[PDB]
Amino acid sequence: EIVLTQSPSSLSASVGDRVTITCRASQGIGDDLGWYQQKPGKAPILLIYGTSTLQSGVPSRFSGSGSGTDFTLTINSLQPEDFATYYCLQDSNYPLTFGGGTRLEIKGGRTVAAPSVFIFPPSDEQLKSGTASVVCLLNNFYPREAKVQWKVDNALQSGNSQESVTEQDSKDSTYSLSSTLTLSKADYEKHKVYACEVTHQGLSSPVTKSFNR
Amino acid sequence: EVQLVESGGGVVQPGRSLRLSCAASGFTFSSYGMHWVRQAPGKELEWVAVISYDGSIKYYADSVKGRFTISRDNSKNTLYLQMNSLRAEDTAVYYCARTGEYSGYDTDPQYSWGQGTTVTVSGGSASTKGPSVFPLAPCSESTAALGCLVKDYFPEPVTVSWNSGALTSGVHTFPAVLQSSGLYSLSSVVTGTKTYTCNVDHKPSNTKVDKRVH
Numbered sequence: 001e002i003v004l005t006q007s008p009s010s011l012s013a014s015v016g017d018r019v020t021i022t023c024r025a026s027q028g029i030g031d032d033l034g035w036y037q038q039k040p041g042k043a044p045i046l047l048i049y050g051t052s053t054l055q056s057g058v059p060s061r062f063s064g065s066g067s068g069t070d071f072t073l074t075i076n077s078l079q080p081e082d083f084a085t086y087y088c089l090q091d092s093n094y095p096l097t098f099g100g101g102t103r104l105e106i107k108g109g110r111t112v113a114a115p116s117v118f119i120f121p122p123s124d125e126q127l128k129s130g131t132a133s134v135v136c137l138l139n140n141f142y143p144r145e146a147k148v149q150w151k152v153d154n155a156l157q158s159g160n161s162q163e164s165v166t167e168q169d170s171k172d173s174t175y176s177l178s179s180t181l182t183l184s185k186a187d188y189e190k191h192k193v194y195a196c197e198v199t200h201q202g203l204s205s206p207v208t209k210s211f212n213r
Numbered sequence: 214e215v216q217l218v219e220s221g222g223g224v225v226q227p228g229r230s231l232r233l234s235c236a237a238s239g240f241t242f243s244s245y246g247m248h249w250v251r252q253a254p255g256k257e258l259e260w261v262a263v264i265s266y267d268g269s270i271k272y273y274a275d276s277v278k279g280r281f282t283i284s285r286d287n288s289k290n291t292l293y294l295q296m297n298s299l300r301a302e303d304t305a306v307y308y309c310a311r312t313g314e315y316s317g318y319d320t321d322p323q324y325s326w327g328q329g330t331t332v333t334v335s336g337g338s339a340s341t342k343g344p345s346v347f348p349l350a351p352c353s354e355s356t357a358a359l360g361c362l363v364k365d366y367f368p369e370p371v372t373v374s375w376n377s378g379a380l381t382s383g384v385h386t387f388p389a390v391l392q393s394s395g396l397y398s399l400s401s402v403v404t405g406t407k408t409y410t411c412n413v414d415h416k417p418s419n420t421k422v423d424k425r426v427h
Contacts (some may be wrong), residue, residue, distance in 0.1 A: 001257070032319075066234035094318050095257070116404070118358040123347040126362075133362060135349055137402055139385070164387040164400065176385045178400045180362075182392075 002026050004088050005198040006099035012107045013078055021073040021102045023088030028068045032092035034071045035064055038101075039169040048073065053183040078104075085170075102171070105173070113174055114202030115141035117194075122188065132188035134181040136196035140174040147199035148179045151208075152191045157181060188213070215239035217309045225299055230272070235292035235309035246329065248313055249294045249306035251305040251327070258323060259305075260314040262294060271311040276302065296332070328417045340365040342396055342416035348426040350401060355383075359426045360402030361411035363417055365394070366418065374403040374412045 003026040021165055023033065031051050036044035046055050048064040051071060052067040061076045075082055083106055088099040116139035138146055142163065160183065167177040177196035179196065194208035223232035233249070249262040261274045262283035271283055282295040292309055310328040312322050342365060349360030363371050373386050380403060387400040401411060410425040 018368075020362075027315075063406060088320045091319060092317075094321050116358075118351060120349040120360065121352050123349075123362075125366075129345075133347070133364065135360070135362065137358060137360070137385075137400075139358065139402075139404055162390045162392070162398075164390050166385050166387055176387070176402075178385075178387045178402070180390070180398065180400065 001095055002029065002090055002093050002097050004090060004097055004099040006086075006102050008102060009100065009186075010103045010105065012105050012110075013083075014107050015080060016077050018105060019075045019078060021086055021088075022204075023066075023071045023073070023099050025069050025071075025090060027093075029090045031067060032090055033064075033066070033071050034089045034091070034113045035062075036087045036089055036098075038087065040084075044085075044087055044098075047089060057164050068123035075104075088152065108172060110142060112202045113140060113142045113172075115139060115146060115177075115198060115200050115207075117198045117209045120209055121194070121213070125157060127188070129186055132185050134183070134194055134196075136179045136181070136198075138175075138177040138179075138198055139193070140169075140172065140176060141200055142174050143201070144168075144175045145201070146175075146177055148177065149197040149199070149206075150179070150181045151193075151195040151197060151210075152181075154192055154195075163198060177178050216305040217326070217331035219307060219327075220310045221259075222307065222332045224333045224335055225246055227300060227334055227336055228298055229298060230297040231332060232331070233294040233296070235294075237290045237309075240311075241289065242290045245311045246313070247285055247292045248310045249281075249292075250310050251310040251332075252304040252308075252323070253302065256305075258314075260411075263313060264292075265296050274369075287322050299332075299334050301334055301337050303317065303332060304337060306331050314388075318342065340367055341417050344371060344399075344413060344415050344422070345421045346413050346423060346424040349400070350426055355405060358402055358404050359409050360400060361399070361413065361424055362391075363399040365392070365396045365398065366415055366420075367396050368417055369397060370415075371397070372414045373399065374414075375406070376410055377405055377412060378398060380409070398415075 005024045007022045033051050034049040035047050037047050038044040047058050063074045065072050088206045119134040119135045120140045121135045161181045163179045195208050197206050197208045216238050218236045225231045246266050261277045262270045264283045280298045284293045306329045308326040344363045344366035347362040383404040386401040389397045413422045
């Protein structure tokens with residue numbers, strides 16, 4: 001299929017700046033390129049089709065150019081409603097293929113956020129199959145760098161836990177992490193307290209959520 | 214009147230061979246380069262073989278190089294594809310077509326190819342495992358958190374909704390992790406008064422589990 005490479009990937013700007021976004025195609029696509037705008041919780045909206053023809057209702061500050069391979073979207077004097085995600089779309093060849101997208105975001109928006117920490121004990125259903133999983137969730141934090149230490153009876157755990165992180169949220173631009181401590185039921189029985197210690201720059205000192213078996 | 218009818222598909226054990234045929238009519242068959250196209254489950258169209266109008270040149274995809282052989286008889290209006298050492302990735306619906314990958318068409322060319330012929334390589338279910346769904350609730354307003362643990366399934370993927378798709382705000386469905394056993398595990402969480410039920414869908418095992426979290 002035809003691959004469209006957008007540049008840049010992200011762009012932090014302020015109200016009133018001039019912004020240019022490029023889209024390069026793997027092969028010639030003629031005038032069959034359009035620019036789309038996507039806001040959080042909504043589908044991409046067509047802004048410009050035919051490389052340069054503005055859709056009815058699109059403000060004059062939006063403009064497009066290029067022909068063949070290299071294409072450019074230009075937003076002169078950004079408005080508060082222009083901050084969204086922008087995609088280039090080709091309908092020259094089947095299948096229709098989008099670009100990677102360009103996130104145009106406010107500059108004063110990536111504020112530090114402390115993670116809300118929650119700890120989940122293993123369910124009674126899982127215990128009757130020989131295994132026991134303890135889950136610790138770090139919800140809505142920025143930046144992405146966080147430390148999750150597993151403690152059981154104040155003993156540090158290692159090599160028996162797995163982490164997974166969500167990508168940057170589209171609405172609040174925060175991160176979320178989940179850690180799973182996997183033990184056998186016999187080893188889960190020989191211990192009482194189960195704690196999850198979280199180190200993040202939004203906290204004054206590590207936050208520990210724990211429970212008793 | 215233009216017609217291209219595929220035949221020869223069926224079930225075949227891995228490592229063994231199978232031959233597909235294509236009958237052509239309604240056009241000057243010896244004046245068109247012929248292709249074999251296929252579509253595997255969850256994947257887009259894949260052009261695996263091409264033979265020139267006269268049969269001199271034969272190009273193959275790297276996916277099938279050294280295992281597949283395309284040929285044609287311009288006196289019988291027939292096209293053939295000899296598939297040897299068949300693997301699980303060869304399980305797909307196979308089409309006989311005149312248009313290549315770089316044809317330039319803006320419309321789905323598969324729409325003009327009919328049903329094609331189906332090749333099913335057996336054994337694509339021995340490693341399939343269905344998931345087990347476990348609740349996630351803290352040990353004793355909108356400040357709490359619940360979730361579901363989707364554990365011990367294979368292969369990918371698993372998708373999760375909440376309250377039959379009615380709940381959307383606050384849901385975080387984490388990418389699945391790979392366990393030491395070779396099976397996958399996924400966690401989905403939500404951050405009240407209403408009930409909370411996760412709906413887990415694992416199509417490789419045709420698993421649909423509704424698990425309410427208490």
